């Protein structure tokens, strides 16, 4: 009976593909062809933050657009003041291998996970002024690749066991499990309305999950290799994914099909980080060729280039007000651009 | 208008002093990535260097501190977290030489994949041909033939530079150096002048694996320092 179910699955996939093809009556090549290009987005580094001994692998911007958290493989979580390059905090980690960090929307807490499969949450606003670990969420059987604070007392973590999880901080036990990915889930992005979230995995597939009810609401394919980054469009009705195939793709949730492709012939390095601008017109992507690119999301062209990193760019972020863009690479240096 | 930014600069200076103290220790120790598979004996080597001085094992030889990371409780798709070990000073690859079954081909393929990884082209590999007593017993028994899985072994001879332990059968040393040369062919196929392989013949009763690792790391650091001077 397994074979008949396989034919049922393949014919259902064929029907879905046919419906997607029918739903596409045009393409963005001629829809936005009458839009003036943004020209050249020339950006220069304003601040350079130093102090990490080993490579910086992830970062997250604050809600106030002032404070930063950066995680380095030496075992350090450093909170910087972007305006004055002042190190506000420096937290040592129990495990040197950290692969993600998140900053709470209220700014009270900071999270980090890694090869230890444990998400450690530290309370910054403590009574005695010394930062100590407040929670250790455990339960993933694979490396924790990305965490994003839904709010206080709730967090979403994607792991290397091909699963995502929504936890409860004070109880310490995960409340919801999102399964369906056949590969390593690499990135997360919370929707602006805080009701859905997209996760791209190491199977050339991304999935939109409903956090409240807890199952794969939608799925999207099109990439050629492992997806390494994902982020929601500011409108909340689209997202962008970068992969190891040296291409970026923009998907729309309502269209449920591939929408835009940002690629170049002379780019053969995978994308490690993806982020949007405040208006959503500029899609910023970090690459393995040691420099970041800035595409016009509506035109699919290189509107800007950020160079100055001596190693692969690993993390990339844009402020809530859009005023500055921070890039962290493997040369232990984090840069601010505006 | 120095009212509070003085306080944040004092906090910055304290943080910088703490970071300098931490850096004085971070690069004074060598981090090692232990790699292997099932029935390879890497856990026995771990307990060996732990009793006598992800999972972490700290040991110390000649007043030099070594941190060894044994990946555990992870899936079998290592194409992603292995990039976390691009700055490791050495990858200790342990392989059971008596598992030809024919598990030696898989070990060779993983060794080739590690050697050819673009994020590990600068990290040297210390090779541990573990379980030499089992290989000797298997060769002396004669029930299993190496040429069954590696036909070219039928046309292989002992290298001239071989230094067998006295009292060893020519057959067992032939097989031992054949496995070593099988690994060394992949080692020398690519990656010239930037990382090297350090094969060794270890076993469970062996007791100088720690000194072997120390010597190999010493050689790696010396070669790196000489290369920085454009002198080697």
């Amino acid at each position: 009976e397994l074979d008949q179910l396989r034919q049922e699955a393949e014919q259902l996939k064929n029907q879905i593909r046919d419906a997607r093809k029918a739903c596409a009556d045009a393409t963005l090549s001629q829809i936005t062809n009458n839009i003036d290009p943004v020209g050249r987005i020339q950006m220069r580094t304003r601040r350079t933050l130093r102090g990490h001994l080993a490579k910086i692998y992830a970062m997250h911007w604050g809600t106030d657009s002032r404070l930063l958290v950066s995680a380095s493989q030496d075992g350090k979580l450093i909170i910087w003041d972007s305006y004055t390059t002042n190190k506000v905090h420096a937290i040592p980690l129990r495990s040197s291998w950290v692969m993600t960090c998140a900053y709470a929307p209220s700014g009270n807490y900071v999270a980090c996970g890694g090869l230890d499969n444990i998400c450690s949450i530290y309370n910054l606003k403590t009574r005695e002024g010394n930062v100590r670990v407040s929670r250790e969420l455990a339960g993933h059987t694979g490396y924790l690749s990305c965490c994003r604070f839904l709010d206080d007392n709730q967090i979403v973590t994607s792991s290397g066991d091909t699963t995502c999880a929504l936890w409860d901080i004070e109880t310490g036990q995960q409340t919801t499990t999102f399964t369906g990915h056949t590969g390593d889930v690499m990135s997360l992005s919370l929707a602006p309305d805080t009701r859905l979230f997209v996760s791209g995995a190491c199977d050339a597939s991304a999935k939109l999950w409903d956090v409240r009810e807890g199952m794969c609401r939608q799925t999207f394919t099109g990439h050629e290799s492992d997806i390494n980054a994902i982020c929601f469009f500011p409108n909340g009705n689209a997202f962008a994914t970068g992969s190891d195939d040296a291409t970026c793709r923009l998907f729309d949730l309502r269209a449920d099909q591939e929408l835009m492709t940002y690629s170049h012939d002379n780019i053969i390095c995978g994308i490690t980080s993806v982020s949007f601008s405040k208006s959503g017109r500029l899609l910023l992507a970090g690459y393995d060729d040691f420099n970041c690119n800035v595409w016009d999301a509506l035109k699919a062209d290189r509107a800007g280039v950020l160079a100055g990193h001596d190693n692969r760019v690993s993390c990339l972020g844009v402020t809530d007000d859009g005023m500055a863009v921070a890039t962290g690479s493997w040369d232990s240096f984090l840069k601010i651009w505006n | 208008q120095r009212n509070e930014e003085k306080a944040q600069r004092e906090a910055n200076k304290k943080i910088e002093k703490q970071l300098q103290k931490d850096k004085q220790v971070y690069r004074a120790t060598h981090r090692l990535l232990l790699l292997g598979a099932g029935e390879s004996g890497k856990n026995t080597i771990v307990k060996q260097m732990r009793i006598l001085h992800i999972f972490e094992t700290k040991f110390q030889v000649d007043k030099v501190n070594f941190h060894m990371f044994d990946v555990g409780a992870q899936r079998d798709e290592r194409r992603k977290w292995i990039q976390c070990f691009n700055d490791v000073t050495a990858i200790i690859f342990v392989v059971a030489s008596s598992s030809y079954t024919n598990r030696l081909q898989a070990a060779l393929k993983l060794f080739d994949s590690i050697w050819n990884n673009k994020w590990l082209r600068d990290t040297s590999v210390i090779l541990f041909l573990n379980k030499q007593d089992l290989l000797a017993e298997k060769v002396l028994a004669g029930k299993s033939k190496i040429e069954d899985y590696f036909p070219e072994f039928a046309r292989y001879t002992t290298p001239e530079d071989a230094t067998p332990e006295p009292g060893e059968d020519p057959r067992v040393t032939r097989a031992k150096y054949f496995i070593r040369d099988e690994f060394l062919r992949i080692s020398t196929a690519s990656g010239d002048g930037r990382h090297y392989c350090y094969p060794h013949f270890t076993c469970a009763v062996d007791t100088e694996n720690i000194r072997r690792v120390f010597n190999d790391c010493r050689d790696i650091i010396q070669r790196m320092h000489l290369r920085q001077y454009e002198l080697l």
Epitope: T182, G183, A204, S225, D244, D245, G270 | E77, R79, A106
Partner: nanobody, 126 residues
Framework: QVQLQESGGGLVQPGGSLRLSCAAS????????MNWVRQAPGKGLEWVSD????????SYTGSVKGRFTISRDNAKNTLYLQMNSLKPEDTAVYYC?????????????????????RGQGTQVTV
């Protein structure tokens, strides 16, 4: 949608020959590395052979060296495995696999248990 479909299996007497075809869709074929793996009774995934982008560099496992031939045609987006002089221990499910990264020499996790870019495989029994 990455897709790899295998065909050409079946039952053959010992000493026979077979041809296994592997059709790829959803991605460019010439920008990465192909390979053939197999899974036999006595559960375990073993690497059989591999071929690079252009097809100049080909490598075989010791057991089938001198017995199997591998080829790739980027024009037709296909891979071929020619099997000569079959032996009783060659009965297995053959998977046409490929490691993900384009333009790379390393090739990870092809023989993994739950690989994503591996085909459904075809039965070869003798």
């Amino acid at each position: 949608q990455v897709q790899l479909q295998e065909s050409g299996g079946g039952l053959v007497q010992p000493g026979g020959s077979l041809r296994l075809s592997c059709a790829a869709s959803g991605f460019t074929f010439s920008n990465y590395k192909m390979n053939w793996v197999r899974q036999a009774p006595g559960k375990g995934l073993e690497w059989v052979s591999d071929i690079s982008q252009s097809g100049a560099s080909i490598s075989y496992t010791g057991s089938v060296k001198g017995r199997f031939t591998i080829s790739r045609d980027n024009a037709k987006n296909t891979l071929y495995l020619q099997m000569n002089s079959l032996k009783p221990e060659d009965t297995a499910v053959y998977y046409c696999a490929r490691c993900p990264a384009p333009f790379t020499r390393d090739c990870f996790d092809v023989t993994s248990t739950t690989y994503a870019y591996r085909g459904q495989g075809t039965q070869v029994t003798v």
